[PDB]
Each structure stands twice: as C-alpha cells, then as structure tokens.
Amino acid sequence: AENLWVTVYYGVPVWKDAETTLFCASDHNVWATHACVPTPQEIHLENVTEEFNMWKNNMVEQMHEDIISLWDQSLKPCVKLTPLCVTLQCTNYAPNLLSNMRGELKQCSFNMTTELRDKKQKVYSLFYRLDVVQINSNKEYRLINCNTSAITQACPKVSFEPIPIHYCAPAGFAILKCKDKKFNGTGPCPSVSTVQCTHGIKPVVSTQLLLNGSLAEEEVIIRSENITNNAKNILVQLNTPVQINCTRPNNNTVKSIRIGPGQAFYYFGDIIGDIRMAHCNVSKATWNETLGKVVKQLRKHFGNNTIIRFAQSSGGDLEVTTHSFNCGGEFFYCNTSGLFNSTWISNNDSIVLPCRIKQIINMWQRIGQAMYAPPIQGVIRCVSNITGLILTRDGGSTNSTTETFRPGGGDMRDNWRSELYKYKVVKIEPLGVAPTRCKRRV
Amino acid sequence: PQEIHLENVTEEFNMWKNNMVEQMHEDIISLWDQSLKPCVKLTPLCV
Amino acid sequence: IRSENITNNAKNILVQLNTPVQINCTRPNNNTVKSIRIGPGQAFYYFG
Amino acid sequence: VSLGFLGAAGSTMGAASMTLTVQARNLLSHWGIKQLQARVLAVEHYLRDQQLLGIWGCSGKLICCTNVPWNSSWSNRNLSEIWDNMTWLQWDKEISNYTQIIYGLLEESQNQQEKNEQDLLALD
Amino acid sequence: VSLGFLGAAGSTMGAASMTLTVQARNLLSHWGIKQLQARVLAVEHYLRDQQLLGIWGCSGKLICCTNVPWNSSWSNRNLSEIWDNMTWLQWDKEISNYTQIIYGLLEESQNQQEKNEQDLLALD
Amino acid sequence: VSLGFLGAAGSTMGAASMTLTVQARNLLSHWGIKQLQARVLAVEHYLRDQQLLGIWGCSGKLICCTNVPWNSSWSNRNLSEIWDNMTWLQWDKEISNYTQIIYGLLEESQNQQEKNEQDLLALD
C-alpha cells in the first residue's frame, strides 16, 4: 500500500514541436481553388506560457514552393508558343504628339507562319518601349527575352483573381496562435489559443507595398531580424488603411490570328480615343499623417534624438526598383517617387504618380520560364485598401550622421511572413504513465 | 458471383438521376486520350 | 562458378573472384568546349 | 466544464484527470498527393500506440492499473505534491530517460506472467 | 437459415437479432488512384466508429448493456410491438433528431463514473 | 533469451510458447507511389485478421481458452508429442484442410452460442 504502483493514462494534453506538411482548404478557373475541401470551433487556452520564434518557421517554405508549383502547373497545357522570334521592322508610333507620351508605344511588323505550313503571312502590332530591344530607315528588333527562356501565353478563359485561402493541419497536430494585440517577432505570449485550420489569406504577388491585406491593431509596429545589423530588410504594418485608385485610360481593341495547327493568338490592336498614360492618385494629407505616425513609432529603435531621411530607390533592374503588382489580368510598374521625398527632425489635393505597363513578365526570379500575357479589351479600373510597406537602409558612419531609409524588397518569401507570424503548428502526444495508489489488481 | 436475394422489402429507384453514368462517361474520355498520347506527334501533314 | 543449366550451352556463365585485382586507365588529352545557342533558350556543347 | 481540445493542459493533474474524452474524440476527427499522404500518416500514427496499448493488457479502457510495483529510485516524491503541485507538462521531463525501462519492464513482466498463471492455474 | 449479407434486413428485429456476423465479416472484405483512394476511404470509415464504440466500454463484444437508464420522453412504446411489429428501417427514423443526445449522455456519464468508482472503490 | 523476430521458429512449441511479444512489436514497425502503396497494405493486412481476432471473443489478449470442444477425427495424437516433438512448421500442414471448418465452428458455434448465453443468461 505504501509501496505505490504505476498506472497508465491516455490522452494527456502535452505536445512537442515537429514538422509535417499541411493542406489547403477554402470555400472561371483560377490557379488555387479548383478542387479543395470546403470548411470555427476556436478554443481559448490559458494558464500557460510558450515562446514563439518566427523566421525559423517552416510552413513559409512549403507554401512558398507549392505556389511555385501551382503557378507553373497552371500554364502548361495551354499553347507552346515558340515561333515568335523573327526580326522586327519597327518604328516609333504616332509622332507629333509632343506630350509626356513620346517614347511610348512603338509599332512593329514581322512575318508569321500561316495555318498551313509553307505559306507566309504579315501582321502588324503595337508594343511598349520596354518590351522589345533593337540589336545593332527602321531598326531591327527582338523582344527582351527571346533568348535564355521560352515563351508561352496564358489561355484566355482562366482568371487571375486571388481567392482567399485557409491552411490546415491534419489530425494529431495542433494550431496555436498568440492573441496578443502587440507582438514583436518573438516573445512569451501569456495568452495563446488553439484552432484547427488557419484564417483566410489572399496571396497576391506584390512588391514594395502590401495590397488588399490584413490590418493590425491600434499601434503600428516594426519587424526585422538583425535590427542594428542592416543586412536584411524591414517590415512595417499600419493600423488604419488609406486607399488608392488607378486605371488605364484606353479602349484599345484586339485582333486574333491563328499561327499553325489549331492555335490562336491575340495581339494588341489599335487605339481608339486619345493617347494618355497610366497614373495613380493618392490622398496627400492622410499619407503624411500615417507616415508621420510610423516614423514617430520607429524612433524608439534609433534613439529619440537623431535625424531621419527618406530617399528614393537605388537602382538595379526594374523588378526591384519599383512597386509592381497585377490588377485584373495585366501588370503594372509605376514610378514610386513622391512618397519618399521628405526629411524629418525633432520639432483636399492629391498626388499624381506616373506608371508604365509591361506586356510580358519574368517573375519568381527563376530564369528559364516566361509567360506571354494577352492584352485585355476594354477600360480598366483598380481600387485598393493600402497596408504596410517594406524598407531597407544603407551603410554609413558614426551614429549621429542622419540615418537614411529607402524602399527596397525584391525577395518573394518575406511577402507572406507579414501575415502568418501568429501561427505555430505542433504535434501532440497522448500517452503517459504515473505511479499512484492502485493496489495492484489481478 | 455470390449474389444474394432479398425479401419483404421495397425500394423506389430513380434512373436518369444516377451518378455513375457520369463517372464512367468521363473516365472513358480520360482513358481514350491517355492511350493515344505517347505515340507519334504528327504535325507537318498540312502543306 | 554459377550457371543455371551448365550442360545446356545456350546461356552465359558467371564466376566470382576471391581477391581483387586492380585497373588503371585514363584519357590523355587536354580538351576544350564551346557553347552555342540552338533556338529559344537552349544551350549546346560540342567538342572543341 | 468541458473546455475543449487540449483544454485543461495548463491546470493541475487532478483537474486534468477529471475529463479526458475531449482528447480521444478529436484524435481521429495535381494536388491530391498530400491529402492522401496526410491521411495514412494520421491513421497509423494513431493506432501504432493503440496496438501498443493493446499489448499492455487494458486495450479497452483508458486507465488501468496492473500488477506491477514501482521503483523509488526513479523518483522519491510523496503522493501529495505529485497530484497537487506539479502538472503534466513538467512530469514527462524527469522520466524522459527511464521511459524505455518503463516500456521495457512493463508487461514483459506482466502480460505473460499473469496469463502464465491463467494458463497454468485457472485453466488447470 | 443464414441468408446472406444484409439478409434479414426486411424482417423483424428479433429474427434480425439472431444472426449478425454476416454484416461483420463483409465489412472489411494511370488508373491506380481511385483504388488507393477507395482502400484508405474504407478503412477509415470502418475504424472511425470502431474507436467510437471502443470508447463505449464494450470494445470487444457486439452487444453490451451498460449502466444507463432510458428517457421515456423519447418514446412511450411498450416492449412487445417494439420487437414484434416494427423493423429496423423504421426504427432509426423517430430517433433521428435525438441521436446526438444519445451519444452525448451515453459516453460522458458512464465510462467515467464507473471508472471513478474503480479508482476510488476497488482500488482503495 | 529473446533471440529476435521469428527467433525460436525452429524450436519446439513449448519453448516457442514462452516468449511471443517479439513477433507483436515488429509487426507494425515520382517514386512515392509504392511507399504509399506499401503502407496501406501493411496496416490493413494487419488489421483484417485483427478484426477477425476481435470477433473471436478475446480481442484483448493473445491466448484465450474458450468454450469449444474438439472433433477427434481431425487428429488422434496423444498430448505429449503434440507439445514435445512436433514443431509449428509441421503443425500447420495436417490441419491445412480443416482450417475453414476450424474457422467455421470457431465462433459461429461460440460467439454465436456464448452470444446466445449472454443473450439469454447474462443479458437475462
């Protein structure tokens, strides 16, 4: 009796951290939700501490690579589009238009194989000045990446809209989430809880700003890794959104030519209307208000007395130097100048921003694949909900010499790290034994 | 085989609303064009 | 020795050694390569 | 009350010993591959130790106490603070080593011996 | 005689209560995908509620009657025509909207209370 | 000693009857297709006759002595050399035919008749 005896228990609530895969669940055809599982039961936890660690999370990786594999799963069974590289006889289109729209929109001309093999065909189109490069009268031209990759077009009936997505773990695993308002990367969260499957995320490709995204709580924050180290980048998140409108001002018809056996092409037709360019309005005062708020925040991390300066982009290629994002089946590239123009010390109108557009993109930083994008008949409107941005810094000198900030970015992986920081999935273990006063029984 | 006869029981059928008609109707599609794929690509027969 | 059928003369013969003997060879020539693009985005190498 | 899945995990062992079915019921409850990968994963990650609790002589229930003594050299702690102060999250740590000699000595000393006595005594 | 699988399904409950293993034995008895899809499907649809009656205190047997009374507010029918006139296909209907409180107060009130009485009486 | 998996397989039955968990514990312990193929056959090749074991009235244990006599026309061998001279690799051969009527009258004369004596004694 005073000798004790061990007994079994089953279902003791303990966990250990591990890693397995997860699965997507949500509720014409888009990339994502062709076939998944349709869908709460949140359970609050208490009297327990836990130490989080983002940037060592794993789920960022497998979601980052299966959306790679999803994206180039999608384009494959549409048309292999090879013979689009013969020389281009080409000129600037429509001179004596002495506006800001001068170098834009060259018109070009070429040869193309017919439906039947031996005959030839001549057909004519418009392109943008960033699309096509001359090699060393007209000049001869080829578009920017006929070499070192192939090209193929997205077959026109599918859509590019981002559906929200839920991520969810299988059984024997658990979703834990910190319910603190303020959170700064890592820390012990005294109020954590569990869920079965994560909330919604709309994974839209973005560079230099986050768009139609999730908000934060009443105090704006920063997140980094190395904070005095300066190698890597800096994420911020606002509390209240500001808005944005832009558009493309043209009506711009299309035409259709077959190439070979049973295939279809679309090229950019000709311009009805006038000639303008894409520009994007923002509210001036609200923008100043929010950026003064975010710098008044981040002065905590660089001393209360120092001078801070905002500068433009550095350079490099176009893919890092400007804010770029799709809208409705095209691609944008604006100038992004007049919002990093200010300096800062201790003591109704809008803002225009010019914006060019490109026709074929090579994203993912993976050279070898390149998509063609069909132009869209009709006018375009595009509104958004503005949230957060990304930032980097330069080198410098001793710590009084007016630190300077620039919008940087480039890498795709951090684009999600802004919105699944609050998640950690873990493996339960239900078996345990313990001594007790069970007078041992036959 | 092993067919089993039943007794003292009724049931109301519903043809034209069956689902297996569809299932086999589409996997015979996928079987048919599965079969022809790895043999000859025959393009240049149009001059 | 190992065969399947030894009186049958149709098939082949296996044996196995008990100690290894060794083998050296090589190609004695210093060689070059050059890279020529084929069409869209492809790379070729030939013997220089 | 029945709080939920992994509910009373922060509380003491006695309150945790009160309600346990909420862990049992939720233990089983181109891109098809990881669906079918997850499901086989989960089902035998369940019943690997369902069968190895089945060899432990109480496959049916969730708490059985069998014919095996306790070695005090594992821990010399009196019964009170075992069940009153330490919780389960701490408890696994100090027997994180002896776990194999638990699982070793457990039923190789029992589920033969008790049914050796069954096969030789009460079927005699 | 042993008719076959789902054999006596039209007959009354008492004759249906006579033979039941004919339902038990048949319960587990490019185009590879739905084969592997179907097999995992069948085995999980089996042992989901195999463990859900394994929790019900008589995991081994096929019929057990445990320590729980009956709410007469569910139905007031005397024992005779329950077992003599109504068959199983009718029987599930009138306890369709209730089955959850069956499964509710069935499990959480029994396999604890009897095992609380284990841990406190028979092991005192 | 515990030799290993299929350890004492050449020895006599009585020594083989001493240690048996070593067979139990090892029993569950582009090219992705056949790993996922192997695992599903492994788990359900196990529990096909685990459930057929479960219907044999002693789902928990590994040896149970139930209420069924023996047709002596199967074999008339005196008890000694049953357990002293013949080993298991021989033993399966001479009952390789009656194995169906073994499984036939196994529990369809027991978990049908001990069923019925539950049903009308223990259920009574």
Ligand SMILES: *[C@@H]1O[C@H](CO)[C@@H](O[C@@H]2O[C@H](CO)[C@@H](O[C@@H]3O[C@H](CO)[C@@H](O)[C@H](O[C@H]4O[C@H](CO)[C@@H](O)[C@H](O)[C@@H]4O)[C@@H]3O)[C@H](O)[C@H]2NC(C)=O)[C@H](O)[C@H]1NC(C)=O
């Ligand atoms: C950011 O937020 C915006 C919020 O507006 C969000 O949604 C957009 O909403 C509008 C409003 O519905 C969508 O615009 C159009 O809706 C009209 C309804 O009359 C349709 O005419 C349009 O397309 C139809 O017509 C085509 C011509 O044949 C068909 O091919 C097509 O299938 C449609 O039937 C169109 O739907 C608009 O689509 C969305 N999306 C966008 C990108 O504007 C927006 O999605 C959020 N995200 C981003 C990244 O902007």
Ligand SMILES: *[C@@H]1O[C@H](CO)[C@@H](O[C@@H]2O[C@H](CO)[C@@H](O[C@@H]3O[C@H](CO)[C@@H](O)[C@H](O)[C@@H]3O)[C@H](O)[C@H]2NC(C)=O)[C@H](O)[C@H]1NC(C)=O
């Ligand atoms: C697309 O291919 C067609 C088919 O060949 C081209 O038509 C022919 O193109 C050639 C060279 O481009 C032309 O030949 C040149 O004509 C002048 C005329 O005097 C001559 O001086 C040159 O020495 C040479 O012969 C030819 O006229 C033309 N037409 C015919 C009926 O043969 C077409 O030009 C191609 N389109 C392009 C390259 O944009």
Ligand SMILES: *[C@@H]1O[C@H](CO)[C@@H](O[C@@H]2O[C@H](CO)[C@@H](O[C@@H]3O[C@H](CO)[C@@H](O)[C@H](O)[C@@H]3O)[C@H](O)[C@H]2NC(C)=O)[C@H](O)[C@H]1NC(C)=O
């Ligand atoms: C395939 O063809 C494309 C386009 O013809 C090549 O891209 C271009 O490569 C040239 C290489 O001479 C680069 O030109 C450089 O431009 C900078 C502009 O700042 C200039 O300062 C340099 O003197 C030089 O001329 C250029 O980076 C690049 N893009 C453009 C728009 O010209 C590509 O290299 C070719 N090869 C492969 C393997 O892709």
Ligand SMILES: *[C@@H]1O[C@H](CO)[C@@H](O[C@@H]2O[C@H](CO)[C@@H](O[C@@H]3O[C@H](CO)[C@@H](O)[C@H](O)[C@@H]3O)[C@H](O)[C@H]2NC(C)=O)[C@H](O)[C@H]1NC(C)=O
């Ligand atoms: C070697 O392989 C083959 C089959 O795998 C067998 O080889 C030869 O088989 C022939 C045909 O039976 C034999 O020849 C004659 O067979 C007739 C049958 O009527 C018999 O009447 C003759 O007297 C003669 O045997 C022959 O013996 C045999 N071997 C040779 C040619 O070397 C043979 O079964 C295999 N060897 C084995 C299994 O050892």
Ligand SMILES: *[C@@H]1O[C@H](CO)[C@@H](O[C@@H]2O[C@H](CO)[C@@H](O)[C@H](O)[C@H]2NC(C)=O)[C@H](O)[C@H]1NC(C)=O
């Ligand atoms: C994140 O915010 C929390 C808010 O509680 C900070 O936690 C404490 O902050 C005080 C400030 O003086 C420190 O002295 C404590 O050491 C912090 N707590 C602990 C347990 O260390 C935390 O410092 C903030 N972290 C970052 C990286 O900003």
Ligand SMILES: *[C@@H]1O[C@H](CO)[C@@H](O[C@@H]2O[C@H](CO)[C@@H](O)[C@H](O)[C@H]2NC(C)=O)[C@H](O)[C@H]1NC(C)=O
């Ligand atoms: C962050 O930057 C510091 C800056 O030097 C890195 O290097 C060590 O820095 C400390 C300052 O505490 C020096 O005293 C050491 O002498 C440096 N190294 C050596 C060899 O002594 C640090 O490595 C950086 N990296 C991170 C992420 O912190």
Ligand SMILES: *[C@@H]1O[C@H](CO)[C@@H](O[C@@H]2O[C@H](CO)[C@@H](O)[C@H](O)[C@H]2NC(C)=O)[C@H](O)[C@H]1NC(C)=O
């Ligand atoms: C963005 O700002 C421009 C510039 O103010 C606006 O353009 C005006 O549009 C109206 C409508 O056709 C014209 O009558 C005006 O002449 C335009 N220019 C000016 C200077 O007012 C535009 O409406 C704004 N909004 C969007 C979505 O582009």
Ligand SMILES: *[C@@H]1O[C@H](CO)[C@@H](O[C@@H]2O[C@H](CO)[C@@H](O)[C@H](O)[C@H]2NC(C)=O)[C@H](O)[C@H]1NC(C)=O
């Ligand atoms: C853009 O161009 C289209 C193409 O011409 C215009 O649509 C035409 O509008 C007239 C006016 O009623 C109709 O009679 C034609 O039938 C329309 N054509 C087609 C193909 O539908 C359109 O008006 C232009 N402007 C805008 C703002 O869309």
Ligand SMILES: *[C@@H]1O[C@H](CO)[C@@H](O[C@@H]2O[C@H](CO)[C@@H](O)[C@H](O)[C@H]2NC(C)=O)[C@H](O)[C@H]1NC(C)=O
């Ligand atoms: C975006 O706009 C800025 C502002 O005009 C451009 O930066 C100017 O570039 C020219 C040519 O190098 C310089 O001479 C100017 O000094 C720069 N600033 C000014 C005041 O113009 C920039 O080139 C444009 N394109 C982008 C996105 O860099």
Ligand SMILES: *[C@@H]1O[C@H](CO)[C@@H](O[C@@H]2O[C@H](CO)[C@@H](O)[C@H](O)[C@H]2NC(C)=O)[C@H](O)[C@H]1NC(C)=O
């Ligand atoms: C094979 O030929 C190569 C090509 O000349 C030789 O490599 C050169 O060796 C000289 C001697 O120092 C260097 O200065 C050159 O820079 C080398 N060139 C390259 C491209 O590496 C090489 O030595 C020759 N012999 C071998 C490989 O045995």
Ligand SMILES: *[C@@H]1O[C@H](CO)[C@@H](O[C@@H]2O[C@H](CO)[C@@H](O)[C@H](O)[C@H]2NC(C)=O)[C@H](O)[C@H]1NC(C)=O
């Ligand atoms: C969270 O922790 C607090 C303090 O540890 C728990 O407080 C209870 O306090 C009453 C007051 O007399 C005691 O009777 C209870 O026994 C305490 N419970 C425990 C578990 O210690 C509080 O209940 C805890 N929360 C939960 C859900 O158990």
Ligand SMILES: *[C@@H]1O[C@H](CO)[C@@H](O[C@@H]2O[C@H](CO)[C@@H](O)[C@H](O)[C@H]2NC(C)=O)[C@H](O)[C@H]1NC(C)=O
């Ligand atoms: C309880 O604790 C240990 C665990 O095995 C046992 O102590 C061993 O005793 C033997 C006998 O001399 C020594 O050779 C070992 O070195 C001891 N330690 C270990 C770790 O084995 C002790 O005998 C156990 N008591 C019982 C009853 O089993």
Ligand SMILES: *[C@@H]1O[C@H](CO)[C@@H](O)[C@H](O)[C@H]1NC(C)=O
């Ligand atoms: C943006 O466009 C919408 C279109 O409905 C309009 O209502 C709004 O006034 C515009 N401006 C702002 C600042 O939102």
Ligand SMILES: *[C@@H]1O[C@H](CO)[C@@H](O)[C@H](O)[C@H]1NC(C)=O
């Ligand atoms: C910044 O915002 C303040 C309002 O708090 C205002 O005084 C100032 O003019 C704004 N500056 C710009 C450039 O918008």
Ligand SMILES: *[C@@H]1O[C@H](CO)[C@@H](O)[C@H](O)[C@H]1NC(C)=O
């Ligand atoms: C820095 O400024 C913040 C701004 O409110 C203030 O709260 C804090 O006390 C200051 N700390 C130091 C060390 O100056």
Ligand SMILES: *[C@@H]1O[C@H](CO)[C@@H](O)[C@H](O)[C@H]1NC(C)=O
């Ligand atoms: C900042 O705004 C003023 C006002 O137009 C302008 O003169 C200046 O060039 C701007 N700076 C940049 C970098 O565009």
